[PDB]
Design a protein around this ligand. Sequence first.
Ligand SMILES: Nc1ncnc2c1ncn2[C@@H]1O[C@H](COP(=O)(O)OP(=O)(O)NP(=O)(O)O)[C@@H](O)[C@H]1O
Ligand SMILES: [Mg+2]
Length: 1141
Amino acid sequence: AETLDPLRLPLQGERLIEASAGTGKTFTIAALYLRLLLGLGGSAAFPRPLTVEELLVVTFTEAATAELRGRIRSNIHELRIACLRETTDNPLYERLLEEIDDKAQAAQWLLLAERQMDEAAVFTIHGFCQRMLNLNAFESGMLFEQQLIEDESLLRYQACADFWRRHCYPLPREIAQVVFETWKGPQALLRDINRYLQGEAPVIKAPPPDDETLASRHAQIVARIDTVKQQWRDAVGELDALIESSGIDRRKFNRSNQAKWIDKISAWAEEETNSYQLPESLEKFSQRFLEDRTKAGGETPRHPLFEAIDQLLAEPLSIRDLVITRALAEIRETVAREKRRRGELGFDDMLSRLDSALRSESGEVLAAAIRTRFPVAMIDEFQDTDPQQYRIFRRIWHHQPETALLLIGDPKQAIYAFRGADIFTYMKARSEVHAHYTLDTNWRSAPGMVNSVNKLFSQTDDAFMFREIPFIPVKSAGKNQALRFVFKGETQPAMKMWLMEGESCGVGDYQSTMAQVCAAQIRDWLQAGQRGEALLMNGDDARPVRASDISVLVRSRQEAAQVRDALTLLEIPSVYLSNRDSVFETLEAQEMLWLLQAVMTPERENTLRSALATSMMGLNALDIETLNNDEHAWDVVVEEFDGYRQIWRKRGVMPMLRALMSARNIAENLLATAGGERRLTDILHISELLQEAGTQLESEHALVRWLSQHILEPDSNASSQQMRLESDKHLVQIVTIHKSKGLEYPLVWLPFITNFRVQEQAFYHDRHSFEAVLDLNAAPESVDLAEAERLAEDLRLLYVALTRSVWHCSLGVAPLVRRRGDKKGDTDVHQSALGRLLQKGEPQDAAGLRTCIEALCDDDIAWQTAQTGDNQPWQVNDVSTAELNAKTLQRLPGDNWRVTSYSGLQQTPHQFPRGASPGTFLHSLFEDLDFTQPVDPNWVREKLELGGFESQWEPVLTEWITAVLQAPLNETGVSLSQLSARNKQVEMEFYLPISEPLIASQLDTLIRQFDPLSAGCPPLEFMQVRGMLKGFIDLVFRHEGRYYLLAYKSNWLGEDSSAYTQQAMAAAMQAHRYDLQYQLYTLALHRYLRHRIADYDYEHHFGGVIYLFLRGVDKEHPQQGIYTTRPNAGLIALMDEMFAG
DNA sequence: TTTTTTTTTTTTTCTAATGCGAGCACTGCTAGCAGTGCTCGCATTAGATTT
Ligand SMILES: Nc1ncnc2c1ncn2[C@@H]1O[C@H](COP(=O)(O)OP(=O)(O)NP(=O)(O)O)[C@@H](O)[C@H]1O
Ligand SMILES: [Mg+2]
């Protein structure tokens, strides 16, 4: 191992950089990034300078990714500024500038990089896999559009239930008994193998044969038990004489007990072998049991039956391993198949699919696709690495030239074993890499904390109990030498262990006492910092200890809740950063549901009363009592809820809840009440979720259905449903040890560091092959091999949790006993991670623990006994509130301007079906119809196929169309067939501006003056409108240099042709107010012609208006169906002037 | 193709480990009996993580 200098580090091949915590592993990423962008280092430099898009960086968490991206951006900016100024105030940038040959070109490259920083290739492992799969779906063999699912619990449980149905159902009742004894159902079966299903499959030690079915194992075990029973049956009488004759202590083996045991074993042997249960007395008659208890130098009773019983009881009889193996294969297969069917994908599935692709035949090509894309890749937090990830990284970047690979990690921090990560693969990689580099100095914390840690981990030799993980002392940097933490004028020791009092302490008592002590100490720190006494000082500078800089690191959820409850008992604000609880699980969700349910149907008194009596409203009991008696108050409430329903129907969801909160003053009363701030935040969050979900759901009742559904089954994994932060003020941050990786905290607490657990399951790694091995049998060898790794993981977790703090870290210590009996004897602290380092891995009593603590204590490490904290709430000095006033609006905004059409302002062929779609189809027919050619039957048949009407109309409709085309027109006698494509314009769209507001009264008067149809009808009624007017003219055509306007109408006036006469057509025009319609159309056409036609005249060039009633068109009567009307020129001129100004 | 009624609640783990109490065989002390060492059985209590 060599000391590391970022400028001199060569970037070629594989390089491993390992160092202790807070030594600047992450900080070196930025320096290496800058070196890569500029291509600095000469011999140690990359052969060619690279771009932002060609550097890969892989981090463990998303937050770390964002942090690193931002910091790289900042560093690029600062280095560019330095290159432009040729001077800088930082030593790293100064050395870089000394190394740079040309500074102008360097600044140019840095500028390009800064501009491309949006495309920085900084991902996590799962994001990198997903992105490489999507960018190379062709080589990998995936689909081009893949979906992402975060939670596979439902698919997994469904596959397990399918396995159960297929296998456990057909079984006979006798094998079914044995299966039912082990697992009650698929729910319990999934619980055992849930961990093994996730990630790579575990090698099973001593797997059953492939052809062995359940019935074969059952028959084998039944045969063994039958043999033992028969051997007992044959020797049921000789054993008494054998035991009596031979010499064995009868104090250990009483004659009455012997007779009882013989009777029980005989009764069991005569019993039919229905189940695998064996009596306990067989343990007494084992050869080893007899050999253990016998006279010194005396005859020992020995019989072949005893040897048979000893061989039988040596290993448990069960079908567990076979069923577990079959399920572990079949459920995984089924899940993969279903996910392939739906075209979905998951994180573990992403990694496994990329690995499979690289391992397949085409993967070689895929390898180049990833290798050419990312020449250099830097993996951070490499200690947490799965075998899949290392296989991928090796396959891609092992031996190819012109491609570097930088592995940065600390094995002492490998704490994600539970998540599939492995330390043994890290050590494999460490063996496979030749070069090693190290960081010497700690830049994170005060020199006190560094010395404390160095002293605590130097107690024993090979503290981390792995030969490949040697511990060495680290040295603090010169910048932090001044750091101190002063409490009440006295400098506190860097690390303080709070020892609990007593000999034997239970787990629950330990948790309660330490939670209380931590709460009391945090309260004292806050009280002393509020008066400016307690200060975190860097030399002369200082600052008080806010409730934010204090962090409490916990291992489990229940632990964090135990901390938070006691911490809130002292009225101290705190928040738990690892909280995955869902909002809908709170009571506010239920209250909001009751409120919506009452608003929906205020008629029902029960639902309304239930919604009123919620804590959210804040009514008392006397309020509800008086309100259940007075009818007027109840009626007023019903009325306001009915109005809320109207608001809810019209404006949506959030407006209704907002009006309710305003009228009932819910927000003010909640903020006034103690604790109501969290309540109001949850209410607002639920309101936002309800609005988001009500946008998509069109029905109002569907939203209540959706809310009840979500309340019934809250999804904790959902990100949107995560509970928001209570307040933006200072909060004590409770964070788990795993989530605290790579972070930093001024003051740190570890209330329950001593607490541990013993691993019962047998899952370990072979010391030779370094492969994950699951032993479905409970052989104690496997259990010991697993417990050793558990202890190593606990030691690494302890190291991680200790290296977080900067100024001060406290931690609880107690003589924790995990065994009920022999509490007076040795404690179980030695098994705990911290205890093993305090007692040098030697079991001791409480006095021994206290003496070891006292011996360990020095200037940096001080111990104090833990006592019950004083129950006094933290007092916070309130602050006066200044005068507050909201602004008001002097000028109201105007909605006068708008764009409207005629519809907004207004607001056998005879037996043919009618409607909106039939009318649109009839119009679309003429839209693309050629008038100069006869109708084609195939075209009409195709249009009837499109519309879906009966083909029976096809012979008739064609004829009807010709009746339209050949029908004559106004006295000029124009036939629609006579119109060439040059003299026609179909569906012309027009825009007509209306500058002054259009008043219905000021127009209706003129229209009545110049048109009798308006005089017959009542006055026009519509609101003032200023803006534009849109419209679509059906047809415009010119004949004999005279223009016309044609409008199609398919309204079914009547059943007979008499309803299509002149008077009836005029009546229909007056009824549907087509008068104003054609008047506006004429104004539009007049303006368009005046614009386009040079030397235009209304009387000369205009020809009138023609309404064509399709169904009215009949060959028998020329007048029926067509209507012709010419607006007065004076009306047109006055209307134009009105609309113009 | 016509129509009437009615309002309330119920459940909750399991395994394991020990402490004591009762019974008994052995055995040493002054043939029986008290101590002792032991052992089985019933009741009581503790604990069950982490992206
Ligand atoms: N060369 C340096 N000069 C100045 N400060 C540094 C230097 N290297 C690291 N630091 C500071 O040291 C602190 C922690 O460094 P960091 O890069 O997080 O190391 P680390 O290996 O990531 N710690 P961890 O993530 O827990 O393993 C930060 O405040 C950095 O600014
Ligand atoms: Mg880091």
